[PDB]
Design a protein around this nucleic acid. Structure first.
Ligand SMILES: NC[C@@H]1O[C@H](O[C@H]2[C@@H](O)[C@H](O[C@@H]3[C@@H](O)[C@H](N)C[C@H](N)[C@H]3O[C@H]3O[C@H](CO)[C@@H](O)[C@H](O)[C@H]3N)O[C@@H]2CO)[C@H](N)[C@@H](O)[C@@H]1O
Ligand SMILES: NC[C@@H]1O[C@H](O[C@H]2[C@@H](O)[C@H](O[C@@H]3[C@@H](O)[C@H](N)C[C@H](N)[C@H]3O[C@H]3O[C@H](CO)[C@@H](O)[C@H](O)[C@H]3N)O[C@@H]2CO)[C@H](N)[C@@H](O)[C@@H]1O
Ligand SMILES: NC[C@@H]1O[C@H](O[C@H]2[C@@H](O)[C@H](O[C@@H]3[C@@H](O)[C@H](N)C[C@H](N)[C@H]3O[C@H]3O[C@H](CO)[C@@H](O)[C@H](O)[C@H]3N)O[C@@H]2CO)[C@H](N)[C@@H](O)[C@@H]1O
Ligand SMILES: NC[C@@H]1O[C@H](O[C@H]2[C@@H](O)[C@H](O[C@@H]3[C@@H](O)[C@H](N)C[C@H](N)[C@H]3O[C@H]3O[C@H](CO)[C@@H](O)[C@H](O)[C@H]3N)O[C@@H]2CO)[C@H](N)[C@@H](O)[C@@H]1O
Ligand SMILES: NC[C@@H]1O[C@H](O[C@H]2[C@@H](O)[C@H](O[C@@H]3[C@@H](O)[C@H](N)C[C@H](N)[C@H]3O[C@H]3O[C@H](CO)[C@@H](O)[C@H](O)[C@H]3N)O[C@@H]2CO)[C@H](N)[C@@H](O)[C@@H]1O
Ligand SMILES: [Mg+2]
Ligand SMILES: [Mg+2]
Ligand SMILES: [Mg+2]
Ligand SMILES: [Mg+2]
Ligand SMILES: [Mg+2]
Ligand SMILES: [Mg+2]
Ligand SMILES: [Mg+2]
Ligand SMILES: [Mg+2]
Ligand SMILES: [Mg+2]
Ligand SMILES: [Mg+2]
Ligand SMILES: [Mg+2]
Ligand SMILES: [Mg+2]
Ligand SMILES: [Mg+2]
Ligand SMILES: [Mg+2]
Ligand SMILES: [Mg+2]
Ligand SMILES: [Mg+2]
Ligand SMILES: [Mg+2]
Ligand SMILES: [Mg+2]
Ligand SMILES: [Mg+2]
Ligand SMILES: [Mg+2]
Ligand SMILES: [Mg+2]
Ligand SMILES: [Mg+2]
Ligand SMILES: [Mg+2]
Ligand SMILES: [Mg+2]
Ligand SMILES: [Mg+2]
Ligand SMILES: [Mg+2]
Ligand SMILES: [Mg+2]
Ligand SMILES: [Mg+2]
Ligand SMILES: [Mg+2]
Ligand SMILES: [Mg+2]
Ligand SMILES: [Mg+2]
Ligand SMILES: [Mg+2]
Ligand SMILES: [Mg+2]
Ligand SMILES: [Mg+2]
Ligand SMILES: [Mg+2]
Ligand SMILES: [Mg+2]
Ligand SMILES: [Mg+2]
Ligand SMILES: [Mg+2]
Ligand SMILES: [Mg+2]
Ligand SMILES: [Mg+2]
Ligand SMILES: [Mg+2]
Ligand SMILES: [Mg+2]
Ligand SMILES: [Mg+2]
Ligand SMILES: [Mg+2]
Ligand SMILES: [Mg+2]
Ligand SMILES: [Mg+2]
Ligand SMILES: [Mg+2]
Ligand SMILES: [Mg+2]
Ligand SMILES: [Mg+2]
Ligand SMILES: [Mg+2]
Ligand SMILES: [Mg+2]
Ligand SMILES: [Mg+2]
Ligand SMILES: [Mg+2]
Ligand SMILES: [Mg+2]
Ligand SMILES: [Mg+2]
Ligand SMILES: [Mg+2]
Ligand SMILES: [Mg+2]
Ligand SMILES: [Mg+2]
Ligand SMILES: [Mg+2]
Ligand SMILES: [Mg+2]
Ligand SMILES: [Mg+2]
Ligand SMILES: [Mg+2]
Ligand SMILES: [Mg+2]
Ligand SMILES: [Mg+2]
Ligand SMILES: [Mg+2]
Ligand SMILES: [Mg+2]
Ligand SMILES: [Mg+2]
Ligand SMILES: [Mg+2]
Ligand SMILES: [Mg+2]
Ligand SMILES: [Mg+2]
Ligand SMILES: [Mg+2]
Ligand SMILES: [Mg+2]
Ligand SMILES: [Mg+2]
Ligand SMILES: [Mg+2]
Ligand SMILES: [Mg+2]
Ligand SMILES: [Mg+2]
Ligand SMILES: [Mg+2]
Ligand SMILES: [Mg+2]
Ligand SMILES: [Mg+2]
Ligand SMILES: [Mg+2]
Ligand SMILES: [Mg+2]
Ligand SMILES: [Mg+2]
Ligand SMILES: [Mg+2]
Ligand SMILES: [Mg+2]
Ligand SMILES: [Mg+2]
Ligand SMILES: [Mg+2]
Ligand SMILES: [Mg+2]
Ligand SMILES: [Mg+2]
Ligand SMILES: [Mg+2]
Ligand SMILES: [Mg+2]
Ligand SMILES: [Mg+2]
Ligand SMILES: [Mg+2]
Ligand SMILES: [Mg+2]
Ligand SMILES: [Mg+2]
Ligand SMILES: [Mg+2]
Ligand SMILES: [Mg+2]
Ligand SMILES: [Mg+2]
Ligand SMILES: [Mg+2]
Ligand SMILES: [Mg+2]
Ligand SMILES: [Mg+2]
Ligand SMILES: [Mg+2]
Ligand SMILES: [Mg+2]
Ligand SMILES: [Mg+2]
Ligand SMILES: [Mg+2]
Lengths: 146, 188, 260
RNA sequence: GCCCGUCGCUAGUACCGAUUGAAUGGCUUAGUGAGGCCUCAGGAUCUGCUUAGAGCGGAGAAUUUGGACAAACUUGGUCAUUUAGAGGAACUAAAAGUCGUAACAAGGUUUCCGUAGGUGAACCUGCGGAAGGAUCAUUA
RNA sequence: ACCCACUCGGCACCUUACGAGAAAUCAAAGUCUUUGGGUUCUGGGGGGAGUAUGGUCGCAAGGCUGAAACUUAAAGGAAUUG
RNA sequence: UUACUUUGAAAAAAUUAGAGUGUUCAAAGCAGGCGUAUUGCUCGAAUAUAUUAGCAUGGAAUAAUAGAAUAGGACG
RNA sequence: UAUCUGGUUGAUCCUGCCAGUAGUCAUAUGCUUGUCUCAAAGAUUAAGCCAUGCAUGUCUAAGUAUAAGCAAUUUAUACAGUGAAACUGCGAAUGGCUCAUUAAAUCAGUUAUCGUUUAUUUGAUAGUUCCUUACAUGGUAUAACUGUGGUAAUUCUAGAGCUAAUACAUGCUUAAAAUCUCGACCCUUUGGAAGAGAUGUAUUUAUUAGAUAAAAAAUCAAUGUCUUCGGACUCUUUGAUGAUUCAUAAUAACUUUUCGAAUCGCAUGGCCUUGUGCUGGCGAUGGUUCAUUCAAAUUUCUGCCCUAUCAACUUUCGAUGGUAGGAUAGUGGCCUACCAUGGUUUCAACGGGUAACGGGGAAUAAGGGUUCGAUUCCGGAGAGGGAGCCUGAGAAACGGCUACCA
RNA sequence: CUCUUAAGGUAGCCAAAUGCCUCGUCAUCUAAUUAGUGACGCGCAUGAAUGGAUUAACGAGAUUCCCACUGUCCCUAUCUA
RNA sequence: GUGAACAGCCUCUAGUUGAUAGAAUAAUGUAGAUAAGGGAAGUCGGCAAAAUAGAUCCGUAACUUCGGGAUAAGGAUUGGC
């Protein structure tokens, strides 16, 4: 997961209404717009200091996290800028006064700010339909396992 | 009519779901108006809840903005050149967003020479007052000046012509100007 | 289902109207109001089912169309008009007035206030924002929007409101230990003071409460209405003053005043 | 005594079955394709602006270019549910027919198993089992 | 190599029922209405029938999987006396 | 760090349970009750419920889970 | 509201089913049938087909009356009482019915809209319109109506002539500033100055602000005041959120330029130079944005019955994702273009069945359960089957239209 | 049980390229079928390397039907060497 | 050259231009063609004739000696620039 100079698309990649003037000159030539997701979620280093665009990123992008916030472990990284999380849970079946183990998979967009891999319990939260299946964005990432 | 529903689609598991109900107006969609250069013709659409969308059909001459100058004048919009989605729009010269068109540069040339006083790219004592102050900001770009020699400038449609009815944009500057240049020459 | 629903069925109506099961299939379906018809009193319910002045459906109209009733200072023609919390309802030819306030069981109580105290009302400021030209504005629970308000007023305050004109006569902020009427919930209709406001980021702040008899209980911030300064409301509460006497305690008081 | 199978008659259920068997519905490849909607047009008639008369604008019917939507017809397939059938081949009912007597006594060749072949019928024989045997037993 | 005592781990055996079971019997077939250490498999009256059908495996004989209609008040186990 | 456990909030009305009340009894209903019965007083319409999910909360047993092994550990 | 009995034998104890018993807001049927209260009822078979009737229409003082309409006798000579028709307005998207589809679908409880639309209702919001010639109020067009007509026939209509508006199309109008540009002429310094435009609101794009947490001196361009040849620098404008590119404001433009009252009813007051001058009362209907209300659309989490004689499924031709666009009221593979190869599954996908609309609930009454829910409430779907659509705030409507099939 | 002459048609198959009666009978196909196919079988006179039954693939072999196709026909006409 | 190709069609080299000839254009022939609507009703029988046809993509049943059946069946495409 190493992104290039990030300007490779048939379209130009820039955050909306972010204009660094050609006439005026600064030390780092172009500006950067990041934000604060809220709910005590640290908007990380790579976002502010990265080159990426990602109009779908929880920061540096046009989405907004509201509603549920969920956890679960990364299953599939195979996609691009989205991933699959697996939230395991039990289920109470009263007749036998016992539990059965169910599970659900959540497709979730992942910012190029974060780096995730098969492993990796990860915190994720819901922002609007971004694509088809995906209602959730990766807002927080811990390490994997031993 | 066209349907925006997600239930004609397949489930993420892949299964094909039975038709649960009929089509309802609020999930509809309508036909693109593929707006091309020409004597202005704009059709009204009666939207949801009344109101109006405006179909761009033939669009010449709409508003454009020179970013760094902070000024906006109206010009002709010759045609398209590039387009990230479909070259078909280039070839057919259709106007949408992200268009990268070419516009009349002359009303954009006039403002400059009647402001900064330098003719572009080669009495009234109250005027030399002003032109004195505004200098030292009077260098634009090597890449933004050269197009004034031709008479047409590189601009990108930022409106949604089939929606608003206006076709508007902003002249290309900075690296964004460079990005589409490295396209036009290394593509065509 | 193709549009707006113009009917209400009996048994689907709000429980706090205390309608009877039989007598019809339908309720009045309050009009589109200042108040949500969920929590609201249609004029017909008040006049006919509470004041017992009107005996009919046709009779309630004969009152209104006789120009009799007003509400919050202004005459109200509408049969189903949804008089809500903290309203006025003046009848000149009967000389009375009523401020609508909840029971300790949670129903709208039939509560007479005098020719004054029906001057002003209280309302909870739901939002405060910037309007056109820069003009700030504020709006109450009942949908009164009041312009150029006090920069101190934020959401979850109350506002004392002159009727015949409008605007704002002082106000009461929201902090520890203020008088509060409970707008809806399990504890709806109770009165108390603020033991704490449990903050919750992303919705549903819990508000701790203590009443005159030192009972504790919690509800939603959205249902917490500030009615004034501790032990001193800004309006006139009815009997029991929202004290929530226990069911066991109730039985005695009924068999107490019952004798000889 | 109990008791097996064939054979013989009476009634009943399902099965196999030539019919490239029928019927109903869903999803469908192909071909064709109404209708309104969008769009390129068209311009019966009627008609305003600047200046008999000429230039530029608006209103608009039939008709029409292209497009998406798309019923539906024809022909195929697929899935479902139901169903006709000469004949075939079972099983089940009803009893004291016919043939013998396989099993129950060491049932008169102990019985039974898997397998294999054979026989009007139960059955008979080969091999390897088991004991649920007719032997819990020959340091003698 | 033999004897003797101890101790694991074996193929069985004997006596007692402490218990258990319908009984025959059982050191487990006990620790079960004082009902739960963990876990796998199967059975749910007798037939019809391991039949029909589909699938699958086999060169084949066959194996694995495996119904329903319908029929029936018994079938059965252990033990007792004849 | 979860699973769990308590308290709560937010839970439609009917319906179930259930308080009250003399529909003549009752099934019901949510009425009613006292009066001076010549321009009247007045208490009601309680209460508790599927226990999964979600939300807030107290609990830290039980059972899980992470943590310094070629130190790439902690600390100022 | 913790029970059992009858039946396999010569008798016996077991296994085991058959049989009995009781309940059912559970249906049919038979026999019988007096009184009060109460009241389910073509769901099941066939969302099969239906002769006829009915079921959606609607006027206040307060849009439009010259009815060859009724009525008194109108101060009523513009109208004025009543009031058919017809115009404009609004509704006809509610109800009521049915359970045919529908198995992650609907639905429930629970979230979301920092992802949209909203008639109405309630609450606020508007001095700005012409520019170089109605404001004592512009223009025509038409229905009803009358009259000449066609067709077997319909809630069919032709053409001839009248006349209205809150219909249709038009269109003036008002304060004081203040900031912007551009700039005739005067001509030196730290130099200036008439008067010519521009500024309501909305539409479209671009850019700017929407900020602060703790304190000190040096830099450059031109000023931003100011005093007395000494140059001083005093002061940073936020509303809200967990969170925004939010509210709101700023500049440059843009627009077949949105709204900015040519509108009705009751009154008849007050002023003075007395012109029918000037000014005035409570109402009704409107209208721009905003909030509100009645809603709508999508949406988070978790939860469905039988089936493996269904084990792999999705990806032609959208299957999963990325970008851009288009379309929508708006998010989104909703659609298109390009690009990647993703997405689901033994924790049971995918497929099949359902004599399946989901739920609130119902029957049964040790506990734990078993069974049912077409059906009074809520949500959903549909109006013979399918699709398409006009009007509209709201419909993919059927007691609306268009087509096909039957 | 008998009988002449050794036995006395088993497994299979069938109106079969083997059946007289015979255009057997039943079903199927058709408006109609001495045709075809499926059955039935005391089979004049099937029947086991005189080989019996089955059989994928193959065939200028014999046979029936279907779709397509057509002057084969209705019903004939015209053109060129 | 076209093409899968020693195919068929046209061509360079080379060899031929030889097969009695002239005039007509009846009938019937021999050989080559086309037919409205119907579509095997023709006939012992579809005899003859007609329809199919290359290539690319798609899809492809029973049965089976598992090798086949298979080009099964059924569809779409095809120039030029
Ligand atoms: N890098 C400079 C800029 O930083 C900006 O972000 C910073 C501030 O502009 C932003 O300010 C927020 C603002 O976003 C929001 N819309 C309104 C809010 N009142 C402001 O302030 C907020 O942050 C400040 C601290 O800066 C706090 O003191 C304050 O309590 C908090 N409300 O908080 C950020 C603090 O680091 C943007 N990311 C972007 O424009 C740009 O990157
Ligand atoms: N009602 C008759 C017809 O129903 C049709 O609709 C049918 C379908 O929508 C639906 O059919 C389903 C089908 O979707 C699904 N994929 C398979 C399922 N077996 C079918 O089911 C149907 O047929 C089966 C028998 O096959 C019946 O047992 C069942 O009751 C019936 N619903 O059920 C309906 C049949 O009742 C059409 N609306 C129309 O042609 C006609 O009205
Ligand atoms: N009767 C009033 C109440 O209705 C409620 O009805 C439920 C639904 O109507 C409502 O559903 C959502 C709601 O969660 C959400 N916050 C707002 C949303 N508009 C609602 O959904 C609505 O739109 C969807 C989609 O078009 C429809 O399918 C649905 O019928 C409709 N109610 O959520 C409610 C609770 O799940 C409940 N039955 C109950 O609280 C109460 O009876
Ligand atoms: N035609 C088969 C039908 O099977 C039905 O049920 C059958 C099975 O569903 C049921 O269970 C069988 C079991 O017998 C067999 N010996 C083991 C097998 N795993 C089980 O199978 C069943 O359960 C497993 C999960 O355990 C599922 O994965 C499987 O799909 C399901 N058939 O047992 C039955 C077979 O004995 C009914 N018996 C009847 O409808 C019919 O017999
Ligand atoms: N395969 C087609 C190829 O093209 C030609 O064949 C085509 C034509 O020659 C042939 O034409 C035949 C005609 O010959 C024959 N004698 C009569 C037939 N009706 C015609 O054919 C056509 O007829 C009409 C249209 O005219 C349609 O109804 C019919 O479907 C069509 N096949 O139709 C053939 C297409 O089906 C050449 N014979 C040959 O190159 C090759 O066969
Ligand atoms: Mg990635
Ligand atoms: Mg569609
Ligand atoms: Mg109402
Ligand atoms: Mg609700
Ligand atoms: Mg029989
Ligand atoms: Mg088709
Ligand atoms: Mg068409
Ligand atoms: Mg039979
Ligand atoms: Mg047969
Ligand atoms: Mg005998
Ligand atoms: Mg015998
Ligand atoms: Mg014997
Ligand atoms: Mg013997
Ligand atoms: Mg013997
Ligand atoms: Mg003997
Ligand atoms: Mg023997
Ligand atoms: Mg024996
Ligand atoms: Mg033998
Ligand atoms: Mg025999
Ligand atoms: Mg046995
Ligand atoms: Mg017990
Ligand atoms: Mg059994
Ligand atoms: Mg077997
Ligand atoms: Mg089998
Ligand atoms: Mg025995
Ligand atoms: Mg009760
Ligand atoms: Mg342990
Ligand atoms: Mg027995
Ligand atoms: Mg019984
Ligand atoms: Mg019915
Ligand atoms: Mg009914
Ligand atoms: Mg309805
Ligand atoms: Mg289904
Ligand atoms: Mg819900
Ligand atoms: Mg006109
Ligand atoms: Mg006319
Ligand atoms: Mg006329
Ligand atoms: Mg903005
Ligand atoms: Mg009003
Ligand atoms: Mg794949
Ligand atoms: Mg399609
Ligand atoms: Mg995308
Ligand atoms: Mg997009
Ligand atoms: Mg969208
Ligand atoms: Mg793939
Ligand atoms: Mg159904
Ligand atoms: Mg059900
Ligand atoms: Mg239901
Ligand atoms: Mg019970
Ligand atoms: Mg119970
Ligand atoms: Mg029990
Ligand atoms: Mg039904
Ligand atoms: Mg049912
Ligand atoms: Mg309903
Ligand atoms: Mg019908
Ligand atoms: Mg209208
Ligand atoms: Mg509908
Ligand atoms: Mg309707
Ligand atoms: Mg319809
Ligand atoms: Mg109807
Ligand atoms: Mg024989
Ligand atoms: Mg012979
Ligand atoms: Mg023999
Ligand atoms: Mg033999
Ligand atoms: Mg024969
Ligand atoms: Mg024959
Ligand atoms: Mg044969
Ligand atoms: Mg023969
Ligand atoms: Mg024949
Ligand atoms: Mg024959
Ligand atoms: Mg035959
Ligand atoms: Mg025979
Ligand atoms: Mg024979
Ligand atoms: Mg004979
Ligand atoms: Mg012979
Ligand atoms: Mg021989
Ligand atoms: Mg021989
Ligand atoms: Mg022979
Ligand atoms: Mg042979
Ligand atoms: Mg062959
Ligand atoms: Mg052949
Ligand atoms: Mg052949
Ligand atoms: Mg042949
Ligand atoms: Mg021919
Ligand atoms: Mg070649
Ligand atoms: Mg060749
Ligand atoms: Mg010769
Ligand atoms: Mg000659
Ligand atoms: Mg000839
Ligand atoms: Mg010939
Ligand atoms: Mg020809
Ligand atoms: Mg012909
Ligand atoms: Mg033809
Ligand atoms: Mg044909
Ligand atoms: Mg023939
Ligand atoms: Mg013939
Ligand atoms: Mg013949
Ligand atoms: Mg031939
Ligand atoms: Mg020919
Ligand atoms: Mg292939
Ligand atoms: Mg095979
Ligand atoms: Mg083929
Ligand atoms: Mg074949
Ligand atoms: Mg081509």
């Amino acid at each position: 997961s190493t992104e290039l100079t990030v300007q490779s698309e048939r379209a130009f990649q820039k955050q909306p209404h972010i204009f660094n003037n050609p006439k005026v000159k600064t030390s780092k030539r172009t500006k950067r717009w990041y934000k604060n997701a809220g709910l005590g979620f640290k908007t990380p280093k790579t976002a502010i200091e990265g080159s990426y665009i990602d109009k779908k990123c929880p920061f540096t992008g046009l989405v907004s996290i509201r509603g549920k916030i969920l956890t679960g472990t990364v299953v599939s990284t195979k996609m691009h800028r989205t991933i699959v999380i697996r939230r395991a849970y039990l289920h109470y079946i009263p007749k036998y006064n016992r539990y059965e183990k169910r599970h659900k998979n959540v497709p979730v967009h992942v910012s190029p700010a974060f780096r995730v891999q098969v492993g990796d319990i990860v915190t994720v939260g819901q922002c609007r339909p971004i694509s088809k299946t995906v209602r959730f964005n990766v807002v927080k990432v811990s390490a994997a396992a031993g | 009519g066209i349907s925006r529903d997600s239930r004609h689609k397949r489930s993420a598991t892949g299964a094909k779901r039975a038709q649960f109900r009929k089509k309802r107006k609020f999930e509809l969609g309508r036909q693109p108006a593929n707006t091309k250069i020409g004597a202005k013709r704009i059709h009204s659409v009666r939207t949801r809840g009344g109101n109006k969308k405006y179909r761009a059909l033939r669009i010449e001459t709409g508003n454009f903005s020179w970013a760094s100058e902070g000024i906006s004048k109206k010009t002709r919009i010759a045609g398209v050149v590039y387009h990230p989605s479909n070259n078909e729009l280039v070839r057919t010269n259709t106007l949408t967003k992200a268009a990268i068109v070419q516009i009349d540069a002359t009303p954009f040339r006039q403002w400059f020479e009647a402001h900064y006083g330098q003719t572009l790219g080669k009495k009234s004592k109250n005027a030399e007052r002003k032109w004195a102050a505004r200098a030292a900001s009077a260098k634009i770009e090597s890449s933004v000046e050269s197009q004034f020699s031709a008479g047409r400038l590189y601009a990108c449609i930022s409106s949604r012509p089939g929606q608003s009815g206006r076709c508007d944009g902003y002249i290309l500057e900075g690296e964004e100007l460079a990005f589409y240049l490295r396209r036009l020459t290394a593509k065509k | 289902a193709r549009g707006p629903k113009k009917h209400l069925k009996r048994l689907a109506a709000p429980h706090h109207w205390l309608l009877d099961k039989l007598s019809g299939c339908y309720a009045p379906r309050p009009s589109a109001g200042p108040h949500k018809l969920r929590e609201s009193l249609p004029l017909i319910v008040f006049l006919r089912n509470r004041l017992k002045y009107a005996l009919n459906g046709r009779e309630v109209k004969a009152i209104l169309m006789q120009r009799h009733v007003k509400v919050d200072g202004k005459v109200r023609t509408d049969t189903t008009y949804p008089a809500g919390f903290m309203d006025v309802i003046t009848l000149d030819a009967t000389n009375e007035n009523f401020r609508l306030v909840y029971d300790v069981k949670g129903r709208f109580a039939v509560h007479r206030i005098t020719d004054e105290e029906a001057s002003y009302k209280l309302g909870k400021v739901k939002k405060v924002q910037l309007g056109k030209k820069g003009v700030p504005y504020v709006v109450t629970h009942d949908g009164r929007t009041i312009r150029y308000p006090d920069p101190n007023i934020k959401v979850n305050d109350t506002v004392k409101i002159d009727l015949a004109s409008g605007k704002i006569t002082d106000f009461i902020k929201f902090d520890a230990g203020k008088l509060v009427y409970v707008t809806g919930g399990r504890n709806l209709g109770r009165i108390g003071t603020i033991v704490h406001k449990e903050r919750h980021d992303g919705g549903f702040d819990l508000v701790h409460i203590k009443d005159s008899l030192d009972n504790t209980f919690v509800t939603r911030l959205n249902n917490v209405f500030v009615i004034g300064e501790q032990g001193k409301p800004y309006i006139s509460l009815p009997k029991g003053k929202g004290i929530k006497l226990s069911i066991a305690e109730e039985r005695d008081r009924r068999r107490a005043q019952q004798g000889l």
